[PDB]
Amino acid sequence: GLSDGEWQLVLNVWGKVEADLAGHGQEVLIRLFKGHPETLEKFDKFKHLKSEDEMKRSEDLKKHGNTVLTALGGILKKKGHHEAELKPLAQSHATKHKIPIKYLEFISEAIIQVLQSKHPGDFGADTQAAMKKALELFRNDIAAKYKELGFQG
Numbered sequence: 001g002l003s004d005g006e007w008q009l010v011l012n013v014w015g016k017v018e019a020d021l022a023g024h025g026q027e028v029l030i031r032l033f034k035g036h037p038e039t040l041e042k043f044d045k046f047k048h049l050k051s052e053d054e055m056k057r058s059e060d061l062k063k064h065g066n067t068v069l070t071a072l073g074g075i076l077k078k079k080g081h082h083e084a085e086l087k088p089l090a091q092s093h094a095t096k097h098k099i100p101i102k103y104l105e106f107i108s109e110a111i112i113q114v115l116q117s118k119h120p121g122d123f124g125a126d127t128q129a130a131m132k133k134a135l136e137l138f139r140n141d142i143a144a145k146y147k148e149l150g151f152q153g
């Protein structure tokens with residue numbers, strides 16, 4: 001559970017993300033792929049990218065970074081009243097894409113790194129503790145949709 005003070009820090013720094021939603025989701029995916037090469041395998045269209053500046057040249061990489069932030073944006077703007085937005089995602093991500101909850105922790109960490117790296121002052125300790133709590137409850141709620149279907153996470 002997040003206070004409304006906290007939801008505001010969360011959604012106010014997310015507004016920035018949204019000024020450059022590609023730039024961010026790109027950097028996120030790079031951070032995740034470069035840091036966890038295992039994740040790269042779930043996207044057959046980029047599984048071949050081998051270097052950094054190389055994947056920075058990918059339109060579809062950007063296209064996906066723009067996707068994952070846009071949806072997470074939508075979820076964040078629900079302030080946890082986001083079941084009608086996480087039912088489909090948990091299920092797609094557990095079954096179709098076969099993504100474990102460990103990989104979600106990974107991208108949660110990439111996001112946070114990117115926020116810190118793109119907005120240092122605006123994203124201080126208490127703004128970060130807020131962001132961390134949101135992504136954590138996002139993750140816990142997916143985790144339970146995973147479990148309801150017999151996936152573990």
Ligand code: HEM
Binds near residue numbers: 043099
């Ligand atoms: C913030 C956490 C995440 C969010 C909000 C997110 C969001 C989305 C959305 C909105 C889609 C659209 C397609 C669908 O749902 O059927 C999608 C698809 C997909 N997601 Fe995620 N995702 C997250 C984490 C991950 C991670 C960590 C991976 C892999 C390591 C992943 C792999 C995929 C793949 C492979 C697809 C299919 C894309 C394609 O088929 O071209 N997702 N995701």
